[PDB]
Amino acid sequence: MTQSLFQPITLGALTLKNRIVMPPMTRSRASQPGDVANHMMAIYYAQRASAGLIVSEGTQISPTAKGYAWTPGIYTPEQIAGWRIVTEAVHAKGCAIFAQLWHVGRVTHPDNIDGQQPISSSTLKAENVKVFVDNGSDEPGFVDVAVPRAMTKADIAQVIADYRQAALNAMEAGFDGIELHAANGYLINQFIDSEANNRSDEYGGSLENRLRFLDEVVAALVDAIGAERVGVRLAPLTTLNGTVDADPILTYTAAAALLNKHRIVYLHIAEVDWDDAPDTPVSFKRALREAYQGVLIYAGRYNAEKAEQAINDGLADMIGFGRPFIANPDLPERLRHGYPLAEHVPATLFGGGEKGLTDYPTYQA
Numbered sequence: 001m002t003q004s005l006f007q008p009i010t011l012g013a014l015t016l017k018n019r020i021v022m023p024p025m026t027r028s029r030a031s032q033p034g035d036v037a038n039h040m041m042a043i044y045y046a047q048r049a050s051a052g053l054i055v056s057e058g059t060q061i062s063p064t065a066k067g068y069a070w071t072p073g074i075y076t077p078e079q080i081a082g083w084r085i086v087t088e089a090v091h092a093k094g095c096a097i098f099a100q101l102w103h104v105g106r107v108t109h110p111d112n113i114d115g116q117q118p119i120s121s122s123t124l125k126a127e128n129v130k131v132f133v134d135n136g137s138d139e140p141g142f143v144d145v146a147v148p149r150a151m152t153k154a155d156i157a158q159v160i161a162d163y164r165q166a167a168l169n170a171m172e173a174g175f176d177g178i179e180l181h182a183a184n185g186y187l188i189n190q191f192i193d194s195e196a197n198n199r200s201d202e203y204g205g206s207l208e209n210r211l212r213f214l215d216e217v218v219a220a221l222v223d224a225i226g227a228e229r230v231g232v233r234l235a236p237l238t239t240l241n242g243t244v245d246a247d248p249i250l251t252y253t254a255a256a257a258l259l260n261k262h263r264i265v266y267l268h269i270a271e272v273d274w275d276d277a278p279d280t281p282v283s284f285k286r287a288l289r290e291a292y293q294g295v296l297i298y299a300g301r302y303n304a305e306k307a308e309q310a311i312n313d314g315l316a317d318m319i320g321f322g323r324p325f326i327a328n329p330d331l332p333e334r335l336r337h338g339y340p341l342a343e344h345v346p347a348t349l350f351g352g353g354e355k356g357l358t359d360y361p362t363y364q365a
């Protein structure tokens with residue numbers, strides 16, 4: 001009945017109001033030119049501040065880390081300032097907010113990264129994957145991804161430096177912490193999953209090698225802003241964006257244990273990606289619960305009953321609700337009272353302005 005869902009929880013040096021998380025959700029509303037977070041985004045997040053924790057939509061750490069049109073960056077002074085408007089608005093409402101540091105790797109198109117070729121662990125193209133670009137109109141233009149080039153040792157050092165600085169930038173922008181996007185087939189995931197990584201150097205070939213990039217990026221993030229302000233997102237079983245691992249139970253239980261050693265403040269599991277909702281064995285969830293002992297967050301087709309059950313069964317500490325939060329700014333209140341939930345409009349998920357972003361009303365009987 002959601003009693004545990006409405007219990008507070010400590011997240012590092014922060015105390016959160018409840019166990020509900022607004023998971024990271026790209027809305028591609030950043031101001032142009034410059035991909036700058038803005039007023040409408042600040043209103044959007046502030047409207048949803050009754051969440052215990054808000055994780056921002058993916059925000060690219062550099063010009064070549066972007067995969068979709070109009071997503072907000074976190075590497076220029078104006079971008080940091082734009083995010084500051086957002087964090088000030090959210091904090092005024094009393095809520096913690098983490099910035100999801102993003103590098104899409106091979107999941108992009110040259111049009112989104114200044115005509116450059118995408119980078120990845122290897123030269124493997126993401127099969128049957130599309131992103132969208134700006135095509136001289138305010139409507140997302142979907143295109144097939146491009147074949148990436150394999151990252152060199154120099155590229156690795158550069159990306160780690162970009163992640164490190166992005167974390168500092170997030171703190172300068174007023175965020176309470178950062179979430180490393182190492183899920184949903186993006187750059188780090190392209191190193192983790194065996195079938196997306198055919199490197200013959202120390203970053204591929206063995207489980208230890210496949211987790212090396214994650215290890216080094218997290219080490220840098222923790223060094224920059226503290227483990228209490230670093231969360232990481234993983235996608236053990238979904239494969240929608242083209243990353244598949246041969247032995248995910250081993251790979252991800254190991255990853256969870258590795259992240260536990262870093263003492264990151266939370267581990268966020270993306271259990272469903274759109275309609276890719278693979279069976280995720282309770283036995284596996286319990287193994288993750290032992291491998292990682294910080295705050296464990298799950299997101300993916302949860303409703304009030306399943307969320308409460310997951311917490312009461314000792315599988316999760318917090319639960320994220322994505323699509324429902326898009327259409328219900330007061331999702332927590334609705335879940336607590338059992339008020340009916342509005343449904344979101346797919347057509348307005350990406351691009352455009354306030355319509356389909358800030359005009360979903362709060363519940364009114």
Ligand SMILES: Cc1cc2nc3c(=O)[nH]c(=O)nc-3n(C[C@H](O)[C@H](O)[C@H](O)COP(=O)(O)O)c2cc1C
Pocket residue numbers: 023024025026027056057058100181183184233270271272273274299300301302320321322323324349
């Ligand atoms: C519009 C849209 C954009 C999303 N963008 C992101 C994001 O930028 N990064 C991320 O890690 N996941 C992202 N997600 C995945 C969500 O965080 C979430 O894991 C997913 O929607 C499953 O939860 P749900 O069934 O409660 O919506 C996106 C989902 C939506 C619906």
Ligand SMILES: CCCCCCCCO[C@@H]1O[C@H](CO)[C@@H](O)[C@H](O)[C@H]1O
Pocket residue numbers: 039040043354
């Ligand atoms: C104390 C109350 C403070 C209210 C501050 C509201 C700031 C609104 O700011 C406005 O947001 C609009 C989008 O919604 C933009 O189109 C405008 O350019 C922007 O100025």
Ligand SMILES: CC(=O)c1ccc(O)cc1
Pocket residue numbers: 026058068183184273
């Ligand atoms: C654009 C988008 O649909 C999307 C979905 C999942 C991500 O992890 C990041 C972005």
